Design an enzyme around this catalytic site. Sequence first.
Site, PDB file in Angstrom:
ATOM      1  N   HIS A 275      14.449  12.519 -29.895  1.00  9.81           N
ATOM      2  CA  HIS A 275      13.682  11.889 -29.414  1.00  9.81           C
ATOM      3  C   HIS A 275      12.945  11.357 -29.235  1.00  9.81           C
ATOM      4  O   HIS A 275      11.184  11.527 -29.112  1.00  9.81           O
ATOM      5  CB  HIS A 275      13.934  11.614 -31.415  1.00  9.81           C
ATOM      6  CG  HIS A 275      14.277  12.575 -32.248  1.00  9.81           C
ATOM      7  ND1 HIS A 275      15.439  11.698 -33.076  1.00  9.81           N
ATOM      8  CD2 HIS A 275      14.279  13.994 -33.017  1.00  9.81           C
ATOM      9  CE1 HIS A 275      16.203  13.239 -33.641  1.00  9.81           C
ATOM     10  NE2 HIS A 275      15.003  13.669 -33.708  1.00  9.81           N
TER      11      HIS A 275
ATOM     12  N   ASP B 268       8.773  21.696 -31.737  1.00 10.51           N
ATOM     13  CA  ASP B 268      10.843  22.238 -31.653  1.00 10.51           C
ATOM     14  C   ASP B 268      11.496  22.220 -30.687  1.00 10.51           C
ATOM     15  O   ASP B 268      10.697  22.184 -29.455  1.00 10.51           O
ATOM     16  CB  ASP B 268      10.699  23.669 -32.860  1.00 10.51           C
ATOM     17  CG  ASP B 268      12.105  24.132 -33.049  1.00 10.51           C
ATOM     18  OD1 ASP B 268      13.043  23.055 -33.477  1.00 10.51           O
ATOM     19  OD2 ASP B 268      12.103  25.258 -34.058  1.00 10.51           O
TER      20      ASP B 268
ATOM     21  N   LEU C 149     -11.023  12.410 -30.024  1.00  8.64           N
ATOM     22  CA  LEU C 149      -9.896  13.807 -30.353  1.00  8.64           C
ATOM     23  C   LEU C 149      -9.610  12.852 -31.693  1.00  8.64           C
ATOM     24  O   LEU C 149      -9.673  12.324 -31.931  1.00  8.64           O
ATOM     25  CB  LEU C 149      -9.329  13.671 -29.530  1.00  8.64           C
ATOM     26  CG  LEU C 149      -8.113  14.373 -30.211  1.00  8.64           C
ATOM     27  CD1 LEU C 149      -8.728  15.841 -29.629  1.00  8.64           C
ATOM     28  CD2 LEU C 149      -6.656  14.120 -29.048  1.00  8.64           C
TER      29      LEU C 149
END
Lengths: 206, 210
Positions: A27, A10, A104
Amino acid sequence: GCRHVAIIMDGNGRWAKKQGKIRAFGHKAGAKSVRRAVSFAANNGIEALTLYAFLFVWALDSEVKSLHRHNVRLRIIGDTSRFNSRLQERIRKSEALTAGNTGLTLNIAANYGGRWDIVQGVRQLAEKVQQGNLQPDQIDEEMLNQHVCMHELAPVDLVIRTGGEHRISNFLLWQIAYAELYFTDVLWPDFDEQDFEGALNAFANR
Amino acid sequence: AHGCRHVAIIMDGNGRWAKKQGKIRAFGHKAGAKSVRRAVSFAANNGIEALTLYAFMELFVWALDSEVKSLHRHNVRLRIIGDTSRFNSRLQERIRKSEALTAGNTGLTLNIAANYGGRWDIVQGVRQLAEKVQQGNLQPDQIDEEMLNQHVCMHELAPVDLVIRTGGEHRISNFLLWQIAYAELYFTDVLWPDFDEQDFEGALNAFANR
Ligand SMILES: CCCCCCCCCCOc1cccc(C(=O)/C=C(\O)C(=O)O)c1
Ligand SMILES: CCCCCCCCCCOc1cccc(C(=O)/C=C(\O)C(=O)O)c1
Ligand SMILES: CCCCCCCCCCOc1cccc(C(=O)/C=C(\O)C(=O)O)c1
């Protein structure tokens, strides 16, 4: 050691406005912070990283080649059944491409909610009961667990939330019963490898 | 003014507090009970509707009796959440009685976790829904979040606005899961026996500011 880290990313909006720029610029700096956190987790031997942005997948599906070269297994979690079918097929194809990767595992939340996640597993059990395939009093924690997202991966060890709020905001619920919770005021585009290591210590000190 | 209707507390730190004092554990539990009374009076006097407490003992809960009369005299409504069904009939019966005695009270509602887990709480709700599907009363596809919400512990009370955990660890430890999806989480290193009205004011004013 920490095997599965989940991040609520956030602060992109607040970062852009502090920088005196439009929401789009935050963004773009957020997406750079995604690349850096994915790289850092993959180089530090974390088994799974799950990222919740607090559509925007359109962006990602131009990075899938790079993930795949890096031996990353990509998964989208969340309710994508209403996305347009062209996007749904590109999601399907990216997941199939990387499904055999053994490095991963990167889970990207896309229209995800913790309550939804539980409810989707309950609906599945509900069908089994109605088919006569399952008794109500045979439903236990182990069984519900097998029907919520990520039940095949290491348990979530650590949840990081950037951006200053102290809430889970209906990100993972079932899965975080025993996770370390780490909150930082750093905004997501500024969250860097030293910040990530900071969180890995809070866990190491558990 | 603080804006908080329902506070839940993970009460940890009793063992560490006693160790720091060179005491055996029965002393930390006694100081922890004193801190419970203090938090309960604080909540009742500051307009909170509900307080839900999770001790992070079986002989501790049994001794309640003197306590339930004091609650009743302070117009608190008592409820126990958790799986009390493998408890002895006897304990089970004193639980029912204590609830019945105070169920008409109009001040603070006090929920006490006893053999409680977040996962268990969701599971028991799912079983209630599966029963209804099996008796043909409920369709699998009518099951949504609002419906499962109506079957978890405390659904009839205000949503949990704030979770406090004392004692320094930053985890939920399988206390509430469903119910804390939107709650403010407040962790303090203060050990439970030392957590007083000003620490509680501090957590409320922090929720008000955030
Ligand atoms: C909008 C979201 C965009 C970001 C999506 C994540 C894509 C991450 C791309 C790179 O993926 C990896 C994975 C494992 C290791 C590395 C890695 O070593 C990267 C580098 O050394 C480098 O970029 O210099 C990169
Ligand atoms: C198993 C259940 C045990 C929970 C035990 C909690 C015991 C709490 C007893 C104290 O209760 C209250 C409740 C509300 C207000 C007050 C309160 O202000 C009492 C006083 O001012 C006073 O007694 O002088 C005390
Ligand atoms: C002033 C009066 C003191 C208030 C005492 C309140 C504490 C009551 C706690 C009752 O705790 C129990 C009782 C029976 C079982 C359990 C229990 O097993 C809890 C768990 O296993 C768990 O949380 O994982 C806990």
